[model samples]
Target: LNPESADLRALAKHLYDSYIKSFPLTKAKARAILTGKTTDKSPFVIYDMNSLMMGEDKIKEVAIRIFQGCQFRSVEAVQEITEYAKSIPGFVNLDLNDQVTLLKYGVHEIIYTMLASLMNKDGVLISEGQGFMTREFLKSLRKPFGDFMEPKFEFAVKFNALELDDSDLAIFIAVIILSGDRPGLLNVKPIEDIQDNLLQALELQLKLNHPESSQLFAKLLQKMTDLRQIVTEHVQLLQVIKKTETDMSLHPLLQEIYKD
Candidate 1:
């Protein structure tokens, strides 16, 4: 209630370590997964959280359809975010390669937030005038490709559950871009400096904008990790798609960033 009581200089550092986090799952969950020991006795469905059980062949058919539709939405996000990047204080001033590098890596992470905007309690919007695509529906869409989208859907759904406003969304998008730990940043100082300022502003805005939402900032931080996990799973999905035979080629932009 008393944000002014705390100095803003330490807000970014204090809040980030204190609040920001990966996806909501725990190590015990994954150890059981990576070791392949724990038994849930669930059916052998890899994608979509087994929300809807479909025949094996039917799943692939659904996967491709879902991928094209969602990928189209994601591609539209890329175009918008790319132009938005140009508006960031120092984004366009960076070298062109660095700019492309940031966009390539940060696109999906940022776009997931946009997808969250299009989401409802049940699912996200697939087409401009079309009805929403529910979580269970999108989840049962692909194998690993299903892995790519459904997990993101889970993250987006929960984020919407927080009731964040548009101000929060814009700052989070900036965080996705600026805080990305890309390997080759020519001018790290300015970016870091700018990011710190942006984070501080977000903290202040969170208080002003979400006065009653005490846990929202911390929840936002946890999603950062989830966002990374989503991107990681996406890369894995892309690898599988590249190896397997698909009737239509994936979007070149999709393949390019996803290709390692």
Candidate 2:
């Protein structure tokens, strides 16, 4: 085997060991079953490869039940499995071998649930109740779950426009939500305000005439674009001003004059 394969094998073993340690009771139960001393009493005791190949919906259902039944705390014990899955080489690129392994083992659901949890820390759904899209609706989307499972350009434009009275809401929301979290950026407003504004805009749009609505949306899009440009310009100007102040401070005469 290649070096990467050997490394992955070692990592997988480590992950399994960590998993067993975290759930000693579950491990003991599993050992009893394997030794033919007892049968699993759990409603759904997915064992070996069967549990690994579950689909997203099935996995999500299982995860949600697990979360609800345990009050969302039990998921903490599965961290090693999550880490191991994330560490797989070319996981983002989706190598065939990785795909096959995931499918065969039915571990895709576990991975998906972990990723979704990571994406939304509170485990509450992100795209819920902006008046569109249930998980079921998303599954009906054309692309495979592994390949851009969430809506893309067309859906984004439609949903953003529906939410903000402007198709450009897609670009605006993306920049603000995704890029604005970077270091050195000031994140002042609560994220809920952003969601509320977009939802309110959509509600208003529903009452307007088609032509009037389109015009209104265009105006809103222009306004948002202008605001973004202004914020970017302000940031750049501040950086320039800061650099100028620093340079001026380096002058001995200036420092002496300003000395307190």
Candidate 3:
């Protein structure tokens, strides 16, 4: 067994599972509800699945839950990824201030990437998959919060097709965190070397994990660039939110990071 690279899985076994898995519903269960294939989902009744009614209060409720959920998840993610970064061999050696600086700018990309990963071909999930809305329905609410989702859902749904596992996601995110190109980085060369090493291992990891597709690594790398671009546009969407901000409970941290 190639324990060197397999160690990525070993380290991520519980960490990645916890970081990404509070999806509020399962793929099978959510699909059943969203697809009308199994609306009689008695097994998931206890999850407090949203009623199919398209009431205003209900839509607002789901939107609030989703925004709040994302807020909490965002906090969970920045802290979790910071902790996870220490697991990478050389990460702790980076200056503490620099460590946080990278995390500050870099965390949003990773956060958005994971969110997209949770999405389906149906659309981006709200209320953690307990509420899946069509893009139009989602955009129609609260001044078109999900107008930016068209591209986000587009990329994530496509990325989901690659069938990347937790270990693969671990590798994917690990590279993202160790990035050297982020502005204001204190030590660019060392960080770039670390990213280069991860890219090497990540390539091998993807190759072995996806022997049927030589394009997986290339495609996954491109997804990173494209994913960041969508996030750039999302900031613009969030700007629209800033103007009309009202009794909404936008988390302070999200407000800070997203600059709302």
- By lDDT, the best candidate is 3
Q: Candidate 2 regions off by >4 Å?
A: 1-197, 200-214, 246-260
lDDT of each: 0.62, 0.32, 0.65
Looking at candidate 2, what is the lDDT of residue 88?
A: 29
Per-residue lDDT of candidate 1, residues 57-88 (tens digit): 33246567666666786677687677666656
Error of 1 at 167 (Å): 1.8
lDDT string for model 2 (1-260, tens) is 56644543454344344334432333234223323463433222222223423422232333223223322232332333434334322333443443333322222223232223212111112211111123343343332221233322222333324333122222222222222222332332333333344434332333332444555544444444433333344335334544643432132322221121
* lDDT value for model 1: 0.62
The regions of model 1 sitting more than 4 angstroms off are 1-62, 142-148
Q: Backbone clashes per model, in order?
A: 5, 5, 0
TM-score head-to-head 1 vs 3, winner: 3
Candidate 2 lDDT score at position 206: 31
Q: Could you tell me which 10 consecutive residues in candidate 3 have the lowest summed lDDT?
A: 41-50
Model 3 reaches what TM-score against the true structure? 0.74
Residue clash pairs of candidate 3: none
